[PDB]
Protein backbone atom coordinates (compact mmCIF):
# COMPACT_ATOMS: atom_id res chain seq x y z
CA UNK A 1 0.00 0.00 0.00
CA UNK A 2 1.68 2.92 -1.76
CA UNK A 3 0.59 6.07 -0.01
CA UNK A 4 2.41 4.87 3.03
CA UNK A 5 5.67 4.86 1.08
CA UNK A 6 8.10 7.65 1.82
CA UNK A 7 9.10 7.68 -1.93
CA UNK A 8 5.44 8.12 -2.88
CA UNK A 9 4.75 11.84 -3.28
CA UNK A 10 1.14 11.43 -4.37
CA UNK A 11 -0.40 14.35 -6.22
CA UNK A 12 2.49 16.55 -7.25
CA UNK A 13 3.06 17.89 -10.78
CA UNK A 14 5.87 17.10 -13.19
CA UNK A 15 7.34 20.62 -12.70
CA UNK A 16 7.33 20.22 -8.87
CA UNK A 17 9.02 16.79 -9.13
CA UNK A 18 11.69 18.54 -11.29
CA UNK A 19 12.07 21.42 -8.75
CA UNK A 20 12.73 18.79 -6.05
CA UNK A 21 15.06 16.61 -8.16
CA UNK A 22 17.19 19.37 -9.67
CA UNK A 23 18.85 20.04 -6.37
CA UNK A 24 22.67 20.02 -6.87
CA UNK A 25 23.06 17.78 -3.82
CA UNK A 26 21.09 14.93 -5.47
CA UNK A 27 23.26 12.07 -6.85
CA UNK A 28 22.16 10.12 -9.99
CA UNK A 29 19.23 7.86 -9.24
CA UNK A 30 17.47 10.12 -6.72
CA UNK A 31 13.77 9.46 -7.24
CA UNK A 32 10.09 9.74 -6.32
CA UNK A 33 6.78 8.18 -7.50
CA UNK A 34 3.77 10.46 -8.06
CA UNK A 35 0.44 10.38 -9.86
CA UNK A 36 0.55 10.81 -13.65
CA UNK A 37 -0.80 14.29 -14.59
CA UNK A 38 -3.05 13.07 -17.40
CA UNK A 39 -3.30 9.24 -17.27
CA UNK A 40 -5.98 7.99 -14.98
CA UNK A 41 -4.82 5.18 -12.78
CA UNK A 42 -1.22 5.65 -13.88
CA UNK A 43 1.86 6.83 -11.91
CA UNK A 44 5.11 8.47 -12.90
CA UNK A 45 8.53 7.61 -11.63
CA UNK A 46 10.68 10.74 -11.70
CA UNK A 47 14.43 10.16 -11.60
CA UNK A 48 17.49 12.39 -11.44
CA UNK A 49 20.44 11.83 -13.80
CA UNK A 50 23.73 13.57 -14.41
CA UNK A 51 26.22 13.72 -17.28
CA UNK A 52 28.87 16.16 -18.48
CA UNK A 53 26.75 16.73 -21.63
CA UNK A 54 23.58 17.76 -19.79
CA UNK A 55 24.69 18.25 -16.14
CA UNK A 56 21.80 17.52 -13.67
CA UNK A 57 18.54 16.56 -15.32
CA UNK A 58 15.36 14.60 -14.78
CA UNK A 59 13.55 11.71 -16.56
CA UNK A 60 9.92 10.63 -16.13
CA UNK A 61 8.63 7.05 -16.72
CA UNK A 62 5.04 6.01 -16.77
CA UNK A 63 4.08 3.09 -14.51
CA UNK A 64 0.95 1.25 -15.61
CA UNK A 65 -1.10 -0.96 -13.40
CA UNK A 66 -3.33 -3.78 -14.71
CA UNK A 67 -6.78 -4.67 -13.34
CA UNK A 68 -5.09 -8.07 -13.23
CA UNK A 69 -2.85 -6.37 -10.59
CA UNK A 70 0.50 -6.19 -12.29
CA UNK A 71 2.61 -2.98 -12.18
CA UNK A 72 5.10 -2.11 -14.93
CA UNK A 73 7.01 0.49 -16.94
CA UNK A 74 7.53 -2.13 -19.75
CA UNK A 75 4.88 -4.79 -20.13
CA UNK A 76 7.72 -7.24 -20.55
CA UNK A 77 8.81 -6.77 -16.86
CA UNK A 78 5.92 -6.80 -14.42
CA UNK A 79 5.59 -6.84 -10.62
CA UNK A 80 3.00 -7.82 -8.02
CA UNK A 81 3.35 -4.44 -6.25
CA UNK A 82 4.77 -0.96 -6.66
CA UNK A 83 7.19 -1.80 -3.80
CA UNK A 84 8.56 -4.82 -5.73
CA UNK A 85 8.90 -2.60 -8.86
CA UNK A 86 10.92 -0.08 -6.86
CA UNK A 87 13.14 -2.84 -5.29
CA UNK A 88 13.86 -4.29 -8.77
CA UNK A 89 14.84 -0.93 -10.35
CA UNK A 90 17.09 -0.16 -7.37
CA UNK A 91 19.23 -3.08 -8.61
CA UNK A 92 18.76 -2.89 -12.38
CA UNK A 93 19.09 0.27 -14.56
CA UNK A 94 17.56 -1.66 -17.57
CA UNK A 95 16.11 1.14 -19.75
CA UNK A 96 16.13 3.84 -16.97
CA UNK A 97 18.59 6.69 -16.93
CA UNK A 98 20.03 5.18 -13.72
CA UNK A 99 19.20 2.56 -11.10
CA UNK A 100 17.05 3.99 -8.25
CA UNK A 101 19.37 5.08 -5.34
CA UNK A 102 17.76 7.37 -2.71
CA UNK A 103 14.38 8.94 -2.11
CA UNK A 104 14.16 12.57 -3.11
CA UNK A 105 14.49 14.82 -0.11
Within 1-105, strands assigned E span 8-10, 31-35, 43-51, 55-65, 71-72, 78-79
Kindly provide the resolution of this structure in angstroms, with one decimal: 1.6
Count CA within 13 A, CB hemisphere, residue 7. Answer: 20
Residue 46 near residue 59 (C-beta atoms within 8 A): yes
The rounded distance, in Å, linking the Cα atoms of 91 and 29 is: 11
The CA–CA distances, whole Å, from 7 to 2, 3, 30, 54, 74 equal: 9, 9, 10, 25, 20
The rounded distance, in Å, linking the Cα atoms of 68 and 60 is: 24
Residue 45 near residue 64 (C-beta atoms within 8 A): no
User: Domains, the chain, ranges and CATH?
Assistant: 1-105 (3.30.505.10)
Contacts of 29 (CB under 8 A, 6+ apart): 47, 48, 49, 98, 99, 100, 101, 102
Planar angle of CA 16, 92, 62, nearest 5 degrees: 40
Q: Which of 103, 101, 22, 17 is nearest to 61 (CA)?
A: 17
Amino acid sequence: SIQAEEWYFGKITRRESERLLLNAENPRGTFLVRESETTKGAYCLSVSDFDNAKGLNVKHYKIRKLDSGGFYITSRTQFNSLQQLVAYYSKHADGLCHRLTTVCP
